[PDB]
């Protein structure tokens, strides 16, 4: 997760790495894992994803 | 005789021994009737992370072909070779000649 | 139980439980390199430590250290060794001279085993600490360059260095956790000594002990004059410790030179 | 599954003619001299079960092929085992 630039202008671009992790792989880890719920979350909350 | 794409990394400073090993490497493989197609020295490439602590290391590359009864010796030699670091030998995948 | 191939049950025939045997130690004809060895447990005077006083023993055979080097050897078959279970293994060097050695794990058909600096790193022959590798398994080490003493209890003992180490010392003892010891030392290296051996349970009072141990087990047993605690109705209020130790933690080891080591736990 | 040059051999050992691969004379010996080689395996990794599955089912049909063999001719049957040494 490496930023830094030239020409002092407190830009942005910290969001560029906001979409390759962040709270992303934290929600998975936050409280507990999944165990059987992934047995019904990628193979069940998938009915969410067919169109 | 199964082929083997074997690579490995030897400590930086110790890269002095680079040759003596290399010779005395084919000096057993040559001598079990074995075969060695591809083979080439890579170099003191600068490393991805502090492996063994020291982000620089020679590499090599082997791709040889011989009985596991001889690469077994060598297999553990590395472990009991000090000047060497992370070492690895990939099984056959078949004879590959030429590449880098 | 745990290991292969077998350590036998014992038919419940006559008030009993379990023995303990092994394949290959056939020959009992000890060599010639062994001395009588006396008996009791006195000293030029009275007693010291109670217990211990069984018969039949003898056998002293020999060896530690391995101050033959740059020379091969050939296990000529393991053997039973008393006053120390750990078996033994004969062992011949090329010149034609036998010794006894400790009996580490995978030995039998002569095998390699050659002492000396930079020699066969395997389970067999000793190789001075200095040039002893990641040392994850050592053996009967040596407090000093030429002693050879340490942890002779190869009856399942592990000593384990801490890789390749500096200053010239390292070590994590069997139990006494990490203590340092001169690197110019050595070690049987293999580190094992067959301990499917010490998982048994003699069985039956003397018939076990009494070829060895008397009955330490003496408790209060009343008469509160022969000891510090006992008497009364049939109970023993009163902060239990033998000859006024205080026999729970407390511990002693009050000095003498060393204490040149670090960690050793607590609990 | 097995060594190429040895399979072939066994079919030259047992081909009433040459190259009759899918016979029965052979397919026996094939499953047999396979098993006998699988043998020194499982007395090591003594619980690699799935591996042993097709090892059971191996012998399994090996007998279906002797039962057969024997059902349609004994002369051949007691000539195959005389050499294969089976009957266990």
């Amino acid at each position: 997760i490496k930023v830094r630039e030239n020409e002092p202008f407190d830009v942005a671009l910290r969001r560029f790495k906001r979409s390759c992790e962040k709270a992303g792989v934290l929600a998975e880890v936050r409280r507990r894992e999944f165990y059987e719920k992934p047995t019904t979350e990628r193979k069940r909350a998938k009915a969410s994803a067919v169109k | 005789m199964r082929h083997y794409e074997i690579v490995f990394m030897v400590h930086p400073d110790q890269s002095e021994q680079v040759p003596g090993m290399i010779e005395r490497y084919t000096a057993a493989i040559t001598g079990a009737e074995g075969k060695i197609h591809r083979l080439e020295d890579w170099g003191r490439r600068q490393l991805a992370y502090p492996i063994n602590k020291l982000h620089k290391a020679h590499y090599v590359l082997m791709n040889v072909e011989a009985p596991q009864e001889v690469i077994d010796e060598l297999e553990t030699t590395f472990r009991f070779n000090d000047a060497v670091i992370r070492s690895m030998v990939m099984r056959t995948k078949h004879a590959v000649t030429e590449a880098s | 139980v745990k290991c292969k191939p077998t350590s036998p049950g014992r038919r419940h025939v006559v008030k009993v439980v379990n023995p303990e045997l092994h394949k290959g130690k056939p020959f009992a004809p000890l060599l010639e390199k062994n001395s009588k060895s006396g008996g009791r447990n006195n000293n030029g005077r009275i007693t010291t430590r109670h217990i211990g006083g069984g018969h039949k023993q003898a056998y002293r055979i020999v060896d530690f250290k391995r101050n033959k080097d740059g020379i091969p050897a050939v296990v000529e078959r393991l053997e039973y060794d008393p006053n120390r279970s750990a078996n033994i293994a004969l062992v011949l060097y090329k010149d034609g001279e036998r010794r006894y050695i400790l009996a580490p794990k995978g030995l039998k058909a002569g095998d390699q085993i050659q002492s000396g600096v930079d020699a066969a790193i395997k389970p067999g022959n000793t190789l001075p600490m200095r040039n002893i590798p990641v040392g994850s398994t050592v053996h009967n080490v040596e407090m000093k360059p030429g002693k050879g003493g340490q942890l002779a209890r190869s009856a399942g003992t592990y000593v384990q260095i801490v890789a390749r180490d500096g200053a010239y010392v390292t070590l994590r003892l069997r139990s006494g956790e990490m203590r340092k010891v001169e690197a110019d030392c050595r070690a049987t290296l293999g580190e094992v000594g067959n301990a499917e051996h010490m998982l048994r349970v003699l069985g039956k009072a003397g018939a076990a002990r009494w070829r060895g141990v008397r009955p330490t087990v003496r408790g209060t047993a009343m008469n509160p004059v022969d000891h510090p605690h006992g008497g009364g109705e049939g109970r023993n209020f009163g902060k239990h410790p033998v000859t006024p130790w205080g026999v729970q933690t407390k511990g002693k080891k009050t000095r003498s030179n060393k204490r040149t080591d670090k960690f050793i736990v607590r609990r | 599954s097995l060594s190429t040059e040895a399979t072939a051999k066994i079919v030259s050992e047992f081909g009433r003619d040459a190259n009759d691969t899918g016979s029965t004379e052979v397919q026996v010996a094939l499953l047999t001299a396979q098993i006998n080689h699988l043998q020194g395996h499982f007395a090591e990794h003594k619980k690699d079960h799935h591996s042993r599955r097709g090892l059971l089912r191996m012998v399994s049909q090996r007998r279906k092929l002797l039962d057969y063999l024997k059902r349609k001719d004994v002369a051949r049957y007691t000539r195959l085992i005389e050499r294969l040494g089976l009957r266990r």
């Binding site: 790495k17 390759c20 | 590449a99 | - | -």
Partner: protein, 55 residues
């Protein structure tokens, strides 16, 4: 594409976090997404494609 010495080939196949690249947003035959995914595994250990971009 079946090895690693093409480590310049494999370089666009990651990110600023190492995070291996899907066969989702690059539906790449999938059976190629296998004979590429694995090479990064086997290669990462050999001091190339750094596991992460924090260390």
């Amino acid at each position: 594409e079946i090895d690693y010495k093409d480590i310049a080939t494999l370089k666009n196949y990651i990110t600023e976090s190492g995070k291996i690249v899907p066969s989702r947003i690059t539906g790449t035959r999938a059976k190629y997404q296998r004979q590429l995914a694995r090479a990064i595994k086997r290669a990462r250990y050999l001091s190339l494609l750094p596991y992460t971009d924090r260390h």
